[PDB]
């Protein structure tokens, strides 16, 4: 009684960082399947169809340009792709709600819903529908309900979470730690799961494909990200203890990370974690727990976010304090803006939030980042303050020496390699005196900077041994 | 300082004995004495029956005892001869006063530090081996300097050691951790202790730090471990509420190699003598430092553990109509984990106590734990009176289950899997209920027999 | 389920006795048997002196007993033969554990259910007569379902009886309420109980609902009644502060026909075995459903009751120079309301307790409550030793009042009005105070005698 047969036609709705690369891998490993990536952004589709792909990922040019026009297609004709597909990935944003119930915590399902309604309209036959972009738990229930309405057509909804990072996407897709698939505990559900497993089996060992119920798969994505962020918050909390006692956080992280049950990854203390994943997913899970009347669990995971914001705040406090509790019109140089090194991504960057704290104190801020666009920077800061306030307080530099010049303080907020072995003796010389340096990323040599004559601070080190 | 040929350790229990046995084993040229005021414990160490059971410890001790391993109760004398001294006594938790329930009582560390001060003779290296609160070396350091008003350095070298794998763990440790003073004299004494470990441990696995980094590392490491468990336990309740399954989640999550798959077993809650103690010790530290933000964060780990136990008992009570006065319920398991009779901080103790507060009649079976050990443990969290009134103890699980209204599994013993649960069901009160705090039983199998069946991290209704 | 001909009630108390007597009385064809474990109580029911006094009850019982009404201690036999079984047992409040002080204990309801399951034999209709928590019927049903692997339905038929008017309440009820399962078999079972009641109750006063609506309706009705008293009592304090009179307010408010004129008597506070119990049951239910807003809303009724007693006692203590150690205070009234010996949740108990905490010497007079009941009541909220020290019980109000500094009316007995308050004033300590917690005395008259006089709901300084 076979309702879903072998998939030969795959569509992904959403041509962004998740959808594009994932489809490309499918087309590359599965020459028998037609894969079409659709998006109503006709300019972005034109980019994927051009000689310069809209994202840079190592290995991706080779893949897309070999397959495009053969078994990989990029189109803006969404109804036609939907009508012809056997399996449809949904790869859209779930922006955080800005107002109302779950403000600042709940994912907004408007795009997911929009795609589901389009599939309902244009499907024509039985489809497997697959949640690829991060969703709140029970999103598949909402999708299911939208699709079931059109069955007056058979649909199964699967969860297949992404585990991609920027810069390593092709390696992450070609050699994943695991592939996770969740579906309905039902015969039709098992059939649909099996057809998606069959796709991945083309290139992924069966024992690295993990199949679960739909809710476990959706939950596992949030929880995995929560566990990672918890590691960072746990170490960052201990950084304050080190500061208070004369222990060293670099030394504790080493000793702790050598237990094989804990592991040595994600144990770098910092001014705090950033990016479009960690806070968003931890807050999604908090909101979920609140909504389930599990306030104890909610409070437990909120602590991850509490520590992160406390790290950022207490770091800025220390800058404000050491500058005599007064910084109106006073020049401070920020080294770094992007949420981590080696990107232009600013989403949830600790730098945005530390700078905001210093803008409150009316500081005059000179920002340098190797990669982030000037326009992006000024838009970011405006969104958390005002266009007026950044006009007043914010100068962006294309040079680190131009930022540090005549500043009372240096603050390193992104861990760029090029900040290590700047000419710090010269920086010292052209600063105000006494001169202060704050290392939020633990990349600088404390001993050397001390010898140069800086008042020098790092997270996780006591100021006086 | 001062190359080291004579090593002494004060305290002859689960840390100091096994540690000294391994040092002698892998360094023949070092004479190792273990000292202790309990002469009968020293007698046990010098007999054919050693006082503690470690796998492969007998044959390490017997092939070294008399040769370069020595058990004495002459504490002053071994102190007098030594180059390097380990301190390996308890720091039981304060029972009252400042840090009641949280702060380690430094009274044995103090006693021994004062004994070192008297009967010294020369320069010593003094090493904290058993778990201490951070800056306990300051307190040792201060006692010892009142003898040199004789040239000391105090060192931290924490234990990383499970029961039943102590020999395995000593011979092939994940890491060896040593801290001392940041000074020429301090860096000397670190090197001299490094030397000893280099005799059998790769230099790459030997980490050296300052004293506080090392003291703090021990507590934080156990804190990270407990946190993984409380984290997954927190998620077990999400699973119950959504229809997700905790086994499926831990599986998916653990395959991230940055997270790892160890310590993601959900349960009624963690136990044993290190986890809660070290977490609370860390919570106390952070309070003392005016870091209330950090104290709250770590207290969360304990809060969830306690909450996991409370909510499991609440489910048992609720299922049995919110009334369990004089109702029979069987408890399968009492030890804090399987394959031991150690009951320290056991979740079984606390879930039974919650059930005793409702005046439940409780028949306990554990395969290993002594009847005397059980009744005394339950007494110390309740009363000798209440345990007399409420607790029976069986050495047959089938006798516990006979006439019971509920079965409650609290320890993950393998024998609890595939008892005759069809028989058990028939000899129970009906409706019959079973509650799995350890995720070892087959839910679909129990359902089909006709149990009303519950497991942590699984939704009741499918 | 056939037309019912044998009715059993398990529980021979204030509810089951009278209700069965009325059924037996109005339904000559039906054999009614009241059963109880308490052989002495059944003995009383079989004697020339029934164990309760109700107007009209003797006439009904003595005419029917041994014809179609029987009182037995043979529960298994009666269960066996019944078509329809009423459960009329206490659900005393949990004294420990989950819901302590708030949740009803279903132990007796469980007891009876398991006896029904054991001894039934055929189809039974099983009817919750005494007040149960919502979902009690589910727990009943789960016990009875296990037995039929016998054909059971569980109904709710709440009691609306009051002491002193039980026979009129039963013969001419405001409404009869029955809830059953949302099922053909459920609707059948309801029809058979509705047929029993249609023998004397018009059909338009018989109300049929689902089981949960019925169980809930009982608690909510008593909660609404208690709320009226706490509402008017909250306003009594506003009267005192402004110069309004509570008696005038109650009369004006009560003349609105949508409000109604009943249960608007201000007092030192409501009591009895129903009001606090059922509100606190409702409050516990709300907490259990995660409706903390509704829980808090209903807790307000009890908060005001307790605050009314507390503030009245505070007024006594303040007037008496804020010191009452060794100082004699006379208490007029101990029963929860006039014309009864029932003391359960009596405001007098809690006001006397407050006064005992200040080591006042209380001489208590009630026309009806027994000395031994009084002493035992007071001991249960203090101690046997406290009551021997502080409490004297008198058989005469002038004896109580002699040498007193205060008089305190706590129960609205008619004999307290038009005692000789001139003579009382003369024999008191001076200044002499009087406090009317029941609004039965003449304030002007007492003022004229020279009392410092106070009443709830009247401003002291006119």
Curated annotation (Swiss-Prot), chains B, C:
Transmembrane regions: none
Active-site residues annotated for this sequence: 274 (nucleophile)
Consequence of gene loss (knockout): RNAi-mediated knockdown causes a reduction in the size of cortical granules during the first meiotic division.
Record bears the keyword Heme: no
Pathway it works in: Nucleotide-sugar biosynthesis; UDP-alpha-D-glucuronate biosynthesis; UDP-alpha-D-glucuronate from UDP-alpha-D-glucose: step 1/1
Expression (tissue specificity): Expressed in the vulva and in oocytes.
The UniProt record lists the keyword Cell wall biogenesis/degradation: no
Catalytic activity from the UniProt record: UDP-alpha-D-glucose + 2 NAD(+) + H2O = UDP-alpha-D-glucuronate + 2 NADH + 3 H(+)
Keywords associated with the record: NAD, Oxidoreductase
GO terms for cellular component: cytoplasm; nucleus
An individual GO BP term: egg-laying behavior
UniProt enzyme class: oxidoreductase
Superkingdom of this protein's organism: Eukaryota
Residues that hold substrate according to the record: 159-163, 218-222, 258, 265-271, 336-337, 438
This enzyme's EC code(s): 1.1.1.22
Effect listed in the UniProt record for changing residue 344 to H: In n2827; defects in vulva morphogenesis during L4 larval stage
Binding site for NAD(+): 11-16, 36, 41, 89-93, 130-131, 163, 274-277, 344
InterPro entries noted in UniProt: 6-PGluconate_DH-like_C_sf, NAD(P)-bd_dom_sf, UDP-Glc/GDP-Man, UDP-Glc/GDP-Man_DH_C, UDP-Glc/GDP-Man_DH_C_sf, UDP-Glc/GDP-Man_DH_dimer, UDP-Glc/GDP-Man_DH_N, UDPglc_DH_euk
Gene3D superfamilies in the cross-refs: Cytochrome c1, transmembrane anchor, C-terminal, NAD(P)-binding Rossmann-like Domain
Annotated GO MF terms: identical protein binding; NAD binding; UDP-glucose 6-dehydrogenase activity
Primary role: Involved in the biosynthesis of glycosaminoglycans; hyaluronan, chondroitin sulfate, and heparan sulfate.
Family: Belongs to the UDP-glucose/GDP-mannose dehydrogenase family.
Name used for this protein in its record: UDP-glucose 6-dehydrogenase
Source organism per UniProt: Caenorhabditis elegans
Gene name of the encoded protein: sqv-4
């Amino acid at each position: 009684d076979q309702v879903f047969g072998k998939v030969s036609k795959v569509v992904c709705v959403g041509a962004g960082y998740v959808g594009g690369p994932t489809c490309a891998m499918i087309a590359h490993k599965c020459p028998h399947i037609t894969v079409t990536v659709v998006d109503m952004n006709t300019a972005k589709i034109a980019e994927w169809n051009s000689d310069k792909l809209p994202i840079y990922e190592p290995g991706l040019d080779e893949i897309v340009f070999a397959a495009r026009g053969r078994n990989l297609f990029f189109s803006s004709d969404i109804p036609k792709a939907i009508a012809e597909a056997d399996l449809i990935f949904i790869s859209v944003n779930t922006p955080t709600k800005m107002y109302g119930r779950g403000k600042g915590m709940a994912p907004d399902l408007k795009y997911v819903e929009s795609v589901s309604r389009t599939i309902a309209q244009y499907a024509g036959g039985p489809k497997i529908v697959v949640e690829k972009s991060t969703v709140p738990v029970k999103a598949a229930e909402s999708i299911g309900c939208i699709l079931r309405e059109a069955q007056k057509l058979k649909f199964q909804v699967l969860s297949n979470p992404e585990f991609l990072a920027e810069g390593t996407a092709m390696k992450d897709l070609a050699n994943p730690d695991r592939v996770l698939i969740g579906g309905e505990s039902s015969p039709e559900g098992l059939q649909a799961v099996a057809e998606l497993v069959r796709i991945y089996e083309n290139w992924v060992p069966r024992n690295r494909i993990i199949t679960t119920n739909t809710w476990s798969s959706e939950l596992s994505k949030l929880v995995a990200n929560a566990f990672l962020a918890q590691r960072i918050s746990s170490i960052n909390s201990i950084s304050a203890v080190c500061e208070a006692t004369g222990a060293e956080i670099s030394e504790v992280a080493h000793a702790v990370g050598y237990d094989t049950r804990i592991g040595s990854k994600f144990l770098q203390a910092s001014v705090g974690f950033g990016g479009s994943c960690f806070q968003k997913d931890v807050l999604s899970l908090v909101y979920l727990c609140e909504s389930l009347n599990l306030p104890q669990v909610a409070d437990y995971w909120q602590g991850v976010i509490n520590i992160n914001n406390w790290q950022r705040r207490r770091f800025a406090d220390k800058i404000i304090a050491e500058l005599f509790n007064t910084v109106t019109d006073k020049k401070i140089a920020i080294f770094g803006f992007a949420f981590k090194k080696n990107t232009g991504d600013t989403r949830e960057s600790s730098a945005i939030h530390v700078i905001k704290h210093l803008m409150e104190e009316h500081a005059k801020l000179s920002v340098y980042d190797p990669k982030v666009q000037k326009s992006q920077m000024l838009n970011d800061l405006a969104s958390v303050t005002s266009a007026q306030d950044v006009e007043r307080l914010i100068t962006v530099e294309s040079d680190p020496y131009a930022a540090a010049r005549g500043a009372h303080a240096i603050v390193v907020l992104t861990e760029w390699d090029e900040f290590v072995e700047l000419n710090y003796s010269q920086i010292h010389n052209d600063m105000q005196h006494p001169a202060a340096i704050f290392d939020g990323r633990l990349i600088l040599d404390q001993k050397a900077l001390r010898e140069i004559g800086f008042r020098t601070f790092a997270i996780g080190t006591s100021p006086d041994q």
